[PDB]
Design a protein around this ligand. Structure first.
Ligand SMILES: Nc1ncnc2c1ncn2[C@@H]1O[C@H](COP(=O)(O)CP(=O)(O)OP(=O)(O)O)[C@@H](O)[C@H]1O
Ligand SMILES: Cc1ccccc1C(=O)CSc1nc2nc(N)[nH]c(=O)c2[nH]1
Ligand SMILES: [Ca+2]
Ligand SMILES: [Ca+2]
Ligand SMILES: [Ca+2]
Length: 159
């Protein structure tokens, strides 16, 4: 088994409903069990700002799936919750499931890059992650606690 950490975001079609439904669906992924769910946070949009605020959360999922098999499931769940691809970069969406970490693994395939390429620069990923895994160490040895101690991030407000 490995513990995967997944970032959840939603800013369309009742984000609380989307995230609750996503948590049910994540539990239903085979060879996998949810260990921990963070608080829900209401966060201002980064990137384009002409969209509603996000609900952000993090989940710890213990799994014996291959990393790309986990991605298969997270993509399925997004699509089944009505996620539609628009032309605008970083536009709003009903559900976004980003695989932040897959144990200590470094993965670089055509479909999957882990650790998530920008997570160390995103408070809306790191703060919920710290809530559920304060002892976390990244594959490169960096400590989550040290990043959050050193780098300027806005505090998150709970939903
Ligand atoms: N760690 C990861 N988690 C989820 N998807 C990933 C991933 N690494 C690569 N991908 C790939 O990323 C592709 C595009 O996903 P999108 O959701 O449109 C990017 P985004 O989440 O809007 O932006 P971001 O990656 O800057 O957060 C997916 O089809 C998937 O194949
Ligand atoms: C941080 C950042 C810097 C520069 C350009 C883009 C971005 C995005 O994250 C864009 S996509 C995105 N932006 C987001 N904003 C919030 N609050 N929550 C999210 O889950 C979320 N996802
Ligand atoms: Ca399961
Ligand atoms: Ca994302
Ligand atoms: Ca995504």
């Amino acid at each position: 088994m490995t513990v995967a950490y997944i970032a959840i975001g939603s800013n369309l079609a009742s984000p609380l409903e989307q995230v609750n439904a996503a948590l049910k669906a994540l539990g239903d992924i085979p060879e996998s069990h949810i260990l921990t769910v963070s608080s829900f946070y209401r966060t201002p949009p980064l990137g384009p700002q002409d969209q509603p605020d996000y609900l952000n959360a993090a989940v710890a999922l213990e799994t014996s799936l291959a990393p790309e098999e986990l991605l298969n499931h997270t993509q399925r769940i997004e699509l089944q919750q009505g996620r539609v691809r628009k032309a605008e970069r970083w536009g709003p969406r009903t559900l976004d499931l980003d695989i932040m970490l897959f144990g200590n693994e470094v993965i670089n395939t055509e479909r999957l890059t882990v650790p998530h390429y920008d997570m160390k620069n995103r408070g809306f990923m790191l703060w919920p992650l710290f809530e559920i895994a304060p002892e976390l160490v990244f594959p490169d040895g960096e400590m989550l606690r040290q990043i959050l101690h050193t780098r300027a991030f806005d505090k998150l407000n709970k939903w």
